[PDB]
Amino acid sequence: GDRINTVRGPITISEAGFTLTHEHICGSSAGFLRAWPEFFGSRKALAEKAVRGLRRARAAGVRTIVDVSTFDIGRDVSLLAEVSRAADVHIVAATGLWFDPPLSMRLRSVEELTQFFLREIQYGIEDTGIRAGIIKVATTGKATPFQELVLKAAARASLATGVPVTTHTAASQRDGEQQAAIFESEGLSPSRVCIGHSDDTDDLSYLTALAARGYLIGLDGIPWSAIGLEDNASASALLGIRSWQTRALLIKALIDQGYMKQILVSNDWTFGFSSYVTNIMDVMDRVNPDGMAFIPLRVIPFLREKGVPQETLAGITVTNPARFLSPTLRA
Amino acid sequence: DRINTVRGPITISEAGFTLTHEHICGSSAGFLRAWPEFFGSRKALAEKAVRGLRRARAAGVRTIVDVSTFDIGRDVSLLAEVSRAADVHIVAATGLWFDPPLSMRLRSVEELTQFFLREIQYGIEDTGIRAGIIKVATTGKATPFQELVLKAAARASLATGVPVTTHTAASQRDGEQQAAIFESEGLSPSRVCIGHSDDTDDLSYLTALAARGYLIGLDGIPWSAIGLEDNASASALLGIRSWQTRALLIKALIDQGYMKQILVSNDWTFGFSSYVTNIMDVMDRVNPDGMAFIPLRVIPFLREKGVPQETLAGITVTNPARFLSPTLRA
Ligand SMILES: CCOP(=O)(Cc1ccc(C)cc1)OCC
Ligand SMILES: CCOP(=O)(Cc1ccc(C)cc1)OCC
Ligand SMILES: CC(C)OP(C)(=O)OC(C)C
Ligand SMILES: CC(C)OP(C)(=O)OC(C)C
Ligand SMILES: [Zn+2]
Ligand SMILES: [Zn+2]
Ligand SMILES: [Zn+2]
Ligand SMILES: [Zn+2]
């Protein structure tokens, strides 16, 4: 509750500083990176790409990033540790399950999944001794039975460890509502959960409803936009057609209603991406050359130029993250 | 002339008694490294594997083909380690089964071709261990992805000479569509083994494929839920046909003159996480002999039913060697 686990070890709350709460070094699949490294050029190249990108964010002031890649996202902790050490940026690793779990998981029970999540947070990931500092879960519209189980196990592990929960939603379908439901049914405090991909909807009504209950709202895909790239059906399907300004304004909307303490902002960027069409990255890097630095460089000043006081900006990027990430046990 | 094993190349003559469809562990990609305790421990699994392989060895088995693909959680390093301890040759595989992740499902036929060749020519992961066979699958009518897979499989095979082995839903006659696709890519049937064939009682479906030149895989002989019907999961997986019935299919094809087209295995495993928890315990109760089941029980049974030893020797020694030998097209 005093220290936060990173792939380099524990750090104190003050050490975290400017923190990006939903990012990825690589978006892939379990075992993929070890089996076919050439799909990304080479492991060495994915790594140099990541270090450069991370150095750039650090220059703009980023000190910590939370890589929310789960086992099924193809998380490679060794990879995380190596770029973390090289770029000198702290990286928080995750446990949980995304939406592409293999058979060996789909068949597990809630109790077995609970153990698995606990193993990762308390014992370490694989045989590295590296501990996860966050649990990631997801739904794609109406939850599946399996998904239901996932949410429950995430809640149990969190209750037992004090580590927070972060989710992937289909904002459009108001997933957040169903997720809150399950978590509360487990006794988990909304203050330990972040409902992500929220900037993906314009429904301010949905957002404040959640904000109002004590949840954290993740506005994490700021730079995601296929505007001008309407040519590409695939890019458009992923990126959406709302501009980044539209997304950034939600941030101001929430502040305005008085929810500055429940806002978490991120880019949801990546340096590699195998779980999608081939060459989607190329397209992405074209739309956002700034990568992870996009927030500090572009969103921050923009929000400033619109009436938001710097100090408020500092609380959303430093203060909220710290409070969220510190392991906290229920009274 | 030389077959690729997890310990290196071997000459055809060293293969000897070969079991063509087995598994050291039946899991998922990354699973064993992430949650070894699910199996007791990695060390425990390994030790179990070494034991049962030494027993099979005792009985005469010299080589085993582990048909575990990437998505089956194949761990080449585990394989090498137990091959070394037991002193049994193990042949590894490339290909895809029916649980591919997004990263795989989204690739093109050309991409898939590359991955399979990589595993066969360059090696598995970073180990340098080369695959000696390609495993594919269908579970009834092929999906479009599955179609691509079968195509890339056929292509990798043509370029390398390495045989192809498949999983099928025998009862749905999957073999027929697989052949159609394979033939369309130019692949010769003699390079292909249509697996799980013992899962059907339809002799006509089997003789037709044999006639065309395919190898028939009669590989789940010991799989039977007979007396375990109180267990639905178990029964769903093992079936309720007895081991004798499966074995007889072997005699049935010999009798039709296709002994040269027959391949026999157990489809056994020492670890199994892609199923209900505790299935292994059920399985080990059903077949204490493990992989030695073939030699200790099927051979003697067949001999007793009138099959000449020598014929038996052709099936377990000669057929595999021919199948396994990397064969290029004319
Ligand atoms: C064997 C995996 O460890 P374990 O069962 C018990 C365990 C937890 C933490 C440490 C430091 C050692 C051992 O993990 C807890 C869920
Ligand atoms: C995986 C990178 O190697 P490669 O492109 C070419 C390659 C094949 C074999 C050997 C021994 C070295 C290199 O793999 C074959 C498709
Ligand atoms: C793959 C897409 C469709 O979903 P997402 C945005 O959670 O992917 C992660 C890996 C960024
Ligand atoms: C339902 C699945 C588990 O069938 P199968 C027989 O191909 O599994 C292998 C890994 C033994
Ligand atoms: Zn997501
Ligand atoms: Zn993400
Ligand atoms: Zn099979
Ligand atoms: Zn099998």
Curated annotation (Swiss-Prot), chain A:
Protein name: Parathion hydrolase
Binding sites annotated in the UniProt record for Zn(2+) 1: 22, 24, 136, 268
Positions of Zn(2+) 2 binding: 136, 168, 197
Coiled-coil ranges (or none): none
Subunit structure: Homodimer.
Taxonomic path: Bacteria, Pseudomonadati, Pseudomonadota, Alphaproteobacteria, Sphingomonadales
Gene Ontology annotations for the cellular component aspect, listed alphabetically: plasma membrane
InterPro entries, alphabetized: AryldialkylPase_Zn-BS, Metal_Hydrolase, Phosphotriesterase, TAT_signal
Keyword Cell membrane on entry: yes
Membrane topology annotation: Peripheral membrane protein
Keywords linked to the UniProt accession: Cell membrane, Hydrolase, Membrane, Metal-binding, Plasmid, Signal, Zinc
PROSITE patterns: PHOSPHOTRIESTERASE_1 (PS01322), PHOSPHOTRIESTERASE_2 (PS51347), TAT (PS51318)
Cofactor binding summary note: Binds 2 Zn(2+) ions per subunit.
PANTHER family to which the protein is assigned, alphabetical: PHOSPHOTRIESTERASE-RELATED (PTHR10819), PHOSPHOTRIESTERASE-RELATED PROTEIN (PTHR10819:SF3)
Cofactor list: Zn(2+)
Swiss-Prot/TrEMBL catalytic activity: An aryl dialkyl phosphate + H2O = dialkyl phosphate + an aryl alcohol
Predominant place of localization: membrane
Modified residues (N6-carboxylysine): 136
Processing after translation: Predicted to be exported by the Tat system. The position of the signal peptide cleavage has been experimentally proven.
A GO molecular-function descriptor: aryldialkylphosphatase activity
Localization of this protein: Cell membrane
Organism: Sphingobium fuliginis (strain ATCC 27551)
